[PDB]
Design an enzyme around this catalytic site. Structure first.
Site, PDB file in Angstrom:
ATOM      1  N   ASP B  45      15.454 -37.087  -1.971  1.00 54.35           N
ATOM      2  CA  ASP B  45      16.486 -36.676  -2.850  1.00 54.35           C
ATOM      3  C   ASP B  45      17.594 -35.933  -1.989  1.00 54.35           C
ATOM      4  O   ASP B  45      17.416 -34.980  -1.171  1.00 54.35           O
ATOM      5  CB  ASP B  45      15.873 -35.780  -3.749  1.00 54.35           C
ATOM      6  CG  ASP B  45      17.072 -35.387  -4.936  1.00 54.35           C
ATOM      7  OD1 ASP B  45      17.233 -35.997  -5.871  1.00 54.35           O
ATOM      8  OD2 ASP B  45      17.740 -34.470  -4.886  1.00 54.35           O
ATOM      9  N   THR B  78      24.468 -39.485  -5.172  1.00 51.39           N
ATOM     10  CA  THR B  78      25.062 -38.254  -4.775  1.00 51.39           C
ATOM     11  C   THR B  78      24.773 -38.292  -3.157  1.00 51.39           C
ATOM     12  O   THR B  78      25.342 -37.772  -2.566  1.00 51.39           O
ATOM     13  CB  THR B  78      24.605 -36.932  -5.269  1.00 51.39           C
ATOM     14  OG1 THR B  78      23.114 -36.824  -5.104  1.00 51.39           O
ATOM     15  CG2 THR B  78      24.932 -36.806  -6.717  1.00 51.39           C
ATOM     16  N   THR B  79      23.836 -39.263  -2.945  1.00 49.95           N
ATOM     17  CA  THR B  79      23.706 -39.554  -1.476  1.00 49.95           C
ATOM     18  C   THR B  79      24.692 -40.151  -1.031  1.00 49.95           C
ATOM     19  O   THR B  79      25.139 -40.055   0.295  1.00 49.95           O
ATOM     20  CB  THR B  79      22.359 -40.304  -1.308  1.00 49.95           C
ATOM     21  OG1 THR B  79      21.256 -39.723  -1.638  1.00 49.95           O
ATOM     22  CG2 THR B  79      22.419 -40.773   0.255  1.00 49.95           C
ATOM     23  N   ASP B 359      18.187 -37.987 -15.250  1.00 49.90           N
ATOM     24  CA  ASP B 359      18.991 -38.951 -14.451  1.00 49.90           C
ATOM     25  C   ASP B 359      19.688 -40.136 -15.379  1.00 49.90           C
ATOM     26  O   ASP B 359      20.508 -40.546 -15.314  1.00 49.90           O
ATOM     27  CB  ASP B 359      18.065 -39.601 -13.436  1.00 49.90           C
ATOM     28  CG  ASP B 359      17.696 -38.828 -12.407  1.00 49.90           C
ATOM     29  OD1 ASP B 359      18.238 -37.813 -11.879  1.00 49.90           O
ATOM     30  OD2 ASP B 359      16.806 -38.904 -11.613  1.00 49.90           O
TER      31      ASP B 359
END
Lengths: 67, 491
Positions: B45, B78-79, B359
């Site tokens: 994550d 968001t990575t 999510d």
């Protein structure tokens, strides 16, 4: 053991070439059905499956940071 | 020397990006973080990585702000906003070595983003607020990475219909804090209970005396712990709650003892007041909000105008679950409160399962925020690169050379996706571009197919908001880092 796959296309073999194993007393290759060495199916299945998860968990780790 | 200041700012931020570069994708590599609290964690994550990175570099703490902004904006991928930031900074290093002043660089990245958002709007696959086929389609495919994705098909209408009810068709905003997911042990993964009102995690009085339900129930929040250092004192405290005829009482979890001495609990029973205990601070912000009530910290400040109103107050105890639901608030100042109880097997399973649904809730919000689905697999990044490269051919001046470097940086997403998939990097991006020369959305990096194909056909689409905010917020970071001229201490 290899001959069990090599001669399988015949379905008729000099020996089954299966259920042979290591004799930990005399140091010879013996038939385990005639010798009496049996192991649970669920055990070898669970071992091999869990072994993959252990190997993947390590191989997946490509970065380590210390805080 | 400001060139030395900028050099350090770029090198530092690149090192953060090179740390996350390996984490993108379902085949991503895991990072090990040894924390100062003594816990060693391993996870893919991305926000977890930067959150537990504990960045001390003042310049790199902006990269955390980028991640949190991407999470509060779209809430998915968001990575990629860090990876995109990294490539734009690495390309900026090339621009800085070419002798282009940071001000010229930053303004050129501003103009690139303006054109880039338009490019995404062109390739938008149209959606609609009533289109439950595509809404359920995409949402369950965002749940495809979860532990049991076969039971997520039934979790799909949970997220889709619950948000479509809380959100108006013609609406630009959806509040994910107004949709509370609560876990509960027992049941199956496809079993969830969606409630159109606030849901209380506790029941009526613990000891005997619990009324368990109220009709024409007025809900007050008295939070302060009631216990002896006594009869008249402890009793008179709760008496006044009866005076204004408040039928449901919420009590904040105290660090001293249990909510209330049994004298005033059994008295609240004698007052016919349903007593709810162990309410959390954030629960009050959730619960008193939808109910339209104002919380009271102490036991002395009870008043009448803060009375609530609830049509249905009953204890929902299913196979020993023991959770209360309150529906029919009908408060002029309230909003459509939605709360879900997540049933499942193990406490640890339902805890993570709840997070898997958070999510999904972000996915549907992204589609309400801005309509459209966009190809996954980095396909929009290859398409944008081609268009901005085409436009940079007619653009004149140093502004064109910076636009060209922007296009080179856009390859970091399709390149990272291909590397973590184990495909020859040049082979993949070469094929991606050749395919984009013919198709538009017909392209994408496919993990299952080990090649290039249509992620629409592979059921892998992402909200256009995710891509739009990814480029937008990235240009804000590039400006912020390039504008760092010196670092001084204040004391």
């Amino acid at each position: 053991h290899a001959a069990s796959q090599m001669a399988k296309p015949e379905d008729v073999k000099r020996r089954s070439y299966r259920n042979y194993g290591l004799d930990l007393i005399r140091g010879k290759i013996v038939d385990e059905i005639h010798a009496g060495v049996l192991e649970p199916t669920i055990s070898k299945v669970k071992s091999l499956k869990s072994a993959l998860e252990a190997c993947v968990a390590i191989l997946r780790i490509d970065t380590m940071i210390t805080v | 020397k400001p060139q030395e200041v900028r050099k350090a700012n770029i090198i530092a931020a690149r090192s953060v990006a090179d740390a996350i570069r390996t984490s993108l994708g379902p085949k991503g590599m895991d990072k090990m973080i040894k924390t100062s609290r003594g816990e060693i964690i391993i996870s893919n994550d991305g926000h977890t990585i930067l959150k537990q990175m504990a960045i001390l570099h003042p310049v790199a703490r902006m990269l955390v702000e980028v991640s949190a902004a991407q999470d509060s904006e779209a809430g998915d991928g968001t990575t990629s906003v860090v990876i995109l930031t990294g490539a734009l900074l690495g390309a900026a290093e090339r621009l800085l070595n070419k002798g282009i002043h940071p001000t010229i660089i930053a303004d050129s990245f501003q103009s690139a983003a303006k054109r880039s958002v338009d490019i995404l709007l062109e390739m938008c696959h149209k959606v609609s607020l009533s289109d439950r086929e595509q809404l359920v389609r995409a949402a369950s495919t965002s749940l495809s990475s979860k532990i049991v994705s076969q039971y997520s098909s039934f979790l799909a209408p949970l997220a889709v219909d619950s948000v479509l009810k809380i959100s108006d068709e013609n609406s630009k905003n959806v509040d994910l804090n107004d949709i509370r997911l609560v876990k509960k042990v027992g049941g199956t993964i496809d079993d969830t209970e969606m409630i159109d009102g606030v849901v209380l995690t506790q029941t009526a009085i613990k000891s005997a005396g619990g009324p368990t339900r109220k009709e024409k129930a007025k809900i007050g929040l008295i939070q302060f712990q009631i216990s002896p250092p006594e009869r008249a004192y402890l009793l008179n405290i709760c008496k006044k709650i009866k005076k204004a005829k408040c039928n449901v009482l919420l009590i904040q979890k105290s660090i001293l003892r249990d909510a209330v001495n049994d004298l005033a609990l059994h008295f609240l029973s004698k007052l016919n007041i349903m007593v709810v205990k162990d309410i959390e601070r954030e629960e009050i912000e959730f619960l008193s909000k939808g109910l339209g009530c104002k919380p009271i910290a102490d036991i002395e400040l009870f008043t009448e105008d803060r009375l609530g109103s609830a049509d249905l107050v009953e204890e929902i105890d299913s196979d020993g679950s023991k959770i209360v639901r309150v529906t029919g608030i009908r408060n002029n100042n309230a909003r459509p409160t939605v709360s879900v109880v997540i049933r499942g097997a193990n406490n640890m399973i339902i805890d993570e399962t709840e997070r898997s649904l958070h999510d999904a809730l972000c996915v549907i919000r992204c589609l309400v925020k801005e309509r459209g689905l966009i190809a996954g697999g980095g396909a929009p990044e290859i398409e944008i690169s081609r268009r901005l490269s085409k436009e940079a051919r007619s653009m004149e001046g140093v502004q064109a050379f910076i636009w060209q470097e922007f296009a080179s940086a856009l390859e970091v997403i399709p390149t990272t996706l291909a590397e973590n998939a184990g495909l020859n990097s040049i082979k993949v991006v070469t094929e991606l571009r050749s395919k984009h020369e013919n198709g538009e959305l017909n392209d994408g990096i496919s993990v299952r197919r080990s090649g290039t194909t249509n992620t629409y056909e592979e059921h892998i689409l992402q909200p256009v908001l995710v891509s739009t905010s990814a480029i937008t917020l990235a240009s804000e970071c590039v400006k912020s880092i390039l504008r760092i001229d010196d670092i001084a201490f204040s004391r």
